[PDB]
Amino acid sequence: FVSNSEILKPFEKKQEEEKKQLEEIRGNPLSIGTLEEIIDDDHAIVTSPTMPDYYVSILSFVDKELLEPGCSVLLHHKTMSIVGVLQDDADPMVSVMKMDKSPTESYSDIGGLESQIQEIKESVELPLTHPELYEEMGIKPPKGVILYGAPGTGKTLLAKAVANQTSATFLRIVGSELIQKYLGDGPRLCRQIFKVAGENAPSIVFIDEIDAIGTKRYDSNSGGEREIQRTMLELLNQLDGFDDRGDVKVIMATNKIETLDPALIRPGRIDRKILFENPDLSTKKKILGIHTSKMNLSEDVNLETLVTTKDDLSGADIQAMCTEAGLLALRERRMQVTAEDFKQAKERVMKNKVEENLEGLY
Template identity: 40%
Template sequence: MTPKKDPETNPWMKTALVWFGIFAAIILFVSVFDGSKQRVTGDSIAYSDFLSRVDNGQVRDVAIGDDVVSGTLTDDTAFRTAAPNDPRLIDRLTEKNVKFSARPRDEPSFWMILLYQSLPFLLLVGLAFFVLRQMQKNSGSGAMGFGKSKAKMLTEKHGRVTFDDVAGIDESREELQEIVDFLKDPSKFARLGGKIPKGALLVGSPGTGKTLLARAVAGEAGVPFFTISGSDFVEMFVGVGASRVRDMFEQAKKNAPCIVFIDEIDAVGRHRGAGLGNGNDEREQTLNQLLVEMDGFEANEGIIIIAATNRPDVLDPALLRPGRFDRQVVVPRPDIEGREKILAVHSKKLPLAPDVDIRTVARGTPGFSGADLANLCNEAALMAARKGKRLVAMREFEEAKDKVMMGAERKSMVMTEDEKKATAYHEAGHALVSLHVPGCDPLHKVTIIPRGRALGVTWNLPERDRYSMSMKQMKARLALCFGGRIAEQLIYGKDSLNTGASNDIQQATDMARSMVMEYGMSEKLGWLRYRDNQDEVFLGHSVARSQTTSEATAQLIDSEVRALIEEAEATARGVLTDNLHELHRLAEALLEYETLTGDESKRAIAGEDIGRSDGDKHRPAPMSSGGSSIPKTRRPKGPFGDPAPAGA
């Protein structure tokens, strides 16, 4: 049998009772003040009619009050009328032998007077109490409870998460398994004198599953799980954040053993002394209190702090020392095995077609985080639903991958034939350079269909997950950046160049400057670092710290960067000049088919039929699983997608 809900625990019932009480009080107030009028009964008649009836002898008796005259007619009919100040009324009643009496004035009792005077005050108090309760419910800490913690306690009824729901980050999960074992059986470690780490800092890029991993630890251990954001501690009032930290640990002590998860801890744990507060500002006081609570004179046994951030470089060193956050657990982007497991988790709820190969999708998505893979599965399901399909096929996964990486197709964008032809030669130049320059990633797809902010996209994908790049590969990518601009120059001349290669030039410049200043790939400058990407936060602005370089060194850096750019331009120009006939063939194929895969591009260059039927003329063939992968950035840059010219 379903238990009845207690009105105290039902917010709707509590609100209804409050409003019912206010309404009843108003009704009582009106009835009390209007009660004197309701006691005078009878039909209401005009005063002139009353006088005429008195003169005609039709009135038997009369009761005269302050403002109402009531009585009975000879036919036993009760009446009442308004009583103006008429001094002749008594004489007329006496003359006609009408019995009359004076109705005494209603004197309110002591309790009635008390009710009259207290009822407005009670209504104001009740309304104020109701408003304060509503503010307490909305703020979670009361109207005046600024110092109360905003940490929320999650239990199994909110959805239990275990390690079975976390895939692709096995190493990170194993590091946290020891915390789970301690929470389940603390005596196992205490017998040998071991102490469990008081805190674990989860470090990783956005979307890699840090929060999910923390919830899985709580779900596996079966202990209370408090969650709070780092920004919830900081308020405009100095001292509020420190008070909330104290209150949070007090709640945690009452529920120990438990886990306290602080998301985005860099909001409150940044380096101290970076501003002008001299240690007295709100954020630094909050951080100081957090440091004391984690490892101070009073031990907090049974409370494990798990925090997450994607900026560990800005955290205060005192927060990272042993005794507070003893462990830094790196949550990386998953490799191909991890991506396959993550896709298997997210695709359980999808009705998959027989042609869907999760391994193939995983091979084609290096650099994707867990959140990216979940979004990929969701986009594939939405595309299948829009087409009216009952199953999600492999084609939907491929189209979803293109949409996630390059943006949606801009089908409504109308391009002239000249613009379309220029885009075809631009993308063909990128593709041709990638096919002829050693060190370039394999060509995966080239299209002149506008996507996102790009008029066309050339997609080069590494053969496997890449964690570093050699100097040969970087020089090949520099040449790839200039393939589109040089192809337009060879076909249309220098005077017809447009702004479509601005992103290519920006990417090439940044890469060449990094090669010279950061990677030590210049013989003249040697293995020295001339740029530091670490930042300090000062008054809300990011101030880059760089080593002081002389004017001569700066000139040498510029000359070395220019040398790399000119070498890349020469390489791309030589490839396109020697293979100009292949450039024309590939551009013509793009104008006809709009989208080509890597294998189709090679057949088009060789003058062969790409193997499409008339019905699939503008539809690319399904992508193969071998060597399919994507860059680590979700949106393509440079040779992977050229932005539209200004005003396009």
């Protein structure tokens, strides 16, 4: 009380005086509005949402060199004087972005894909970790990277893992859905993405499964060819227009990369095109090892035995197998999972991958 009160009363007093004087002038109902522009006659033209618009004086709460257009400010009754400034609302990462903040997984949990991991690293994780090489040398780390592999198998895993390691907002775009089939929707959607990303940097623009603007055409006509081409061109121009060493990073994703033009990749910004190699034997042990941790099982299971008979199979297969084996236990009314179950799941997935007869198996 009393100890506090002696420091408190004057510390209270300077803030209160400023505040008092503000509130009297600021007296409600005061309409909130948007700065349209800040003018040559030192006025600001404002767009009022009450429908008039005005040339307005500023009361320096913070200065005009600290204020920019489109910012929200609080406006007087009629002359619309800037009585105080406001913080912006409804930042649009809740409308064009599906957000995965501090996403899961890491490099250790799929390890054995180690050589590819260094590649992905060198463009994304590593500049953050060690700025210095990149700065001293004067050349920039690749803005954007392309991952090709397959969903839930290796493409997605690498992307979760790296993004989390750099502690950037993984912001997930559905490529196909941009796909909106009418002249106005896509190029804006794309612009609005890039804008919000650069503002609230460092940020990951993850474009999932872009297959459908992967065409280029020699001539453009009509609406039926031009729409597609406008969307493609918008990505190409923004890249070509700006340059960033990691205010915006891009991961582009597609199953295979032979459906992307080499003139949309754009060497010299996107320098890395990184592959997906299958999990080998060491990796299978690992992928399994992580998935058997979560489990309650029987002691007759041999992690080793099942890996050895698997012929160079995808990380997907390994996930699938665990998921499949749990079901054979659940149906039989039990929580223990015997070896025989893992083996049946392994036999089934291994057959389907290794089916390709008379042209693979000649």
